[PDB]
């Protein structure tokens, strides 16, 4: 079994929720720059490995495997020494996809990306407020989701956890989450935080995001 | 036994009245209307803080989110794994398939469109929302590529929440059938399953119904 590949860059969330995934696994791999700000993407040999053109993508012994969701369930499937990241159990691995899958479409699509493209874009606007709307209903979700539970789907660290502080981490560049408001998230983003690899999986890249973003003179409208 | 909460004009709905006929498993289904707000009754905040349909109630536990949804369903009931393979590799295809749908297709293309005029707001779409469609309909037809199906050549939960979403996106865009042969030929195929009509077709009619009562047109760049 040849070691893992990962393609992407650190400033990315969705690859750094397959970082955090690679650290809690203690599984070794190898990183790949691929740069999307510089379309890097678009390579012929990368459309080979994904035709959908998105890091992260995961090279496993010949076979290539997409969308971060995806890659870290079969991460800990394949790689896990337990299922601990991500049950078998059919109820807890069904919260568990429910949390990723709300982080696929409420979380990156509908409030993250939606932004960053139109901004990577040249368009100078002013973000419309539905946008900013749009980030504030994923923290009232999140703040919500955490009833009760120290993670995202229960009482216990999941591959849900990774994939939503991967986003989180980033949207806080347009709205910082406020602690007064949001105590759950923010109480469980300090959770997070305590994991010995969660710096190097996701903060780094966190703080390059910010870095780049920060490079716009962006505004949002007040209507 | 199961209970399903939604409407059947929803898309996601009904990629779960596809899989549950794929299954041969029976259910309640109890409507509630989002487009009229049952969503935001105290009974139902309580099943699912998110208020989106649909949501089951299976043995008493509430799950939502289609896709979490048809997986459970496939996993717990399926005879065979054959709509939601147990192999690792062919799992992770069906796994992104389902992600691409929640994120590009759904939320990116659909919902997008679809908040803001059931909302009153936008009957001038903008163009960004168009392309979003075609992306979609271009990926769609590389995905499929030589195969039966979307995510390989067996049928699986994938196409059911996708045609789910593309079977109304054509309300908004049709599908150039000489230029994604491919979506074409798949879609004919969904379409001679016995359980399509009752599961899909009834509802993106009911769904196309909705969304022509606006008089929409999409902007230019
Ligand atoms: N929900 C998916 C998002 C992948 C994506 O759009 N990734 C971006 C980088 S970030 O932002 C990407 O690859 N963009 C380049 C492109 O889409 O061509 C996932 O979980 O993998
Ligand atoms: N990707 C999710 C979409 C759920 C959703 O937004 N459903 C809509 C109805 S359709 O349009 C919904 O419940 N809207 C009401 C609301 O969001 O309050 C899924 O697969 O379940």
Same mark, same amino acid.
């Given at each position: 079994m040849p070691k893992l590949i990962l393609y992407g860059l650190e400033a990315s969330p969705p690859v750094r929720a397959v970082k955090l995934t690679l650290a809690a696994? /203690?599984?070794?791999? /190898? $990183?790949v720059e691929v740069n999307t700000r510089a379309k890097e993407n678009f390579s012929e040999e990368f459309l080979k490995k994904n035709p959908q053109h998105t890091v992260p993508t995961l090279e496993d012994d010949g076979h290539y495997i997409w969308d971060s969701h995806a890659i870290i369930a079969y991460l800990v499937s394949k790689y896990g020494k337990?299922?601990?990241?991500?049950?078998?159990?059919?109820?807890? @691995? &069904?919260?568990? *996809?429910? @949390?990723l899958h709300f982080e696929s479409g409420v979380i990156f699509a509908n409030a993250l990306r939606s932004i960053t493209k139109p901004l990577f874009a040249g368009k100078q606007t002013m973000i419309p407020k539905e946008r900013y709307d749009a980030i504030?209903?994923?923290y009232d979700f999140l703040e919500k989701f955490l009833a009760?539970?120290?993670y995202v789907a229960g009482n216990q660290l999941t591959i &849900? *956890? $990774?994939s939503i502080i991967s986003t989180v =981490? =980033?949207? /806080?560049? +347009?709205?910082?989450? *406020?602690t007064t408001k949001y105590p759950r998230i &923010?109480?469980? $983003?300090? @959770?997070?935080?305590?994991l010995p690899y969660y710096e190097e999986a996701?903060?780094?890249? &966190?703080?390059? +995001? /910010?870095? +780049?973003? @920060?490079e716009y003179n962006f505004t949002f409208a007040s209507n």
């Open positions: 696994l /203690e599984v070794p791999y /190898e $990183f337990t299922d601990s990241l991500y049950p078998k159990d059919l109820l807890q @691995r &069904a919260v568990v *996809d429910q @949390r504030i209903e994923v009760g539970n120290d &849900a *956890d $990774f =981490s =980033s949207l /806080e560049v +347009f709205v910082k989450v *406020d &923010a109480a469980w $983003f300090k @959770r997070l935080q305590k996701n903060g780094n890249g &966190a703080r390059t +995001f /910010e870095s +780049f973003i @920060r």
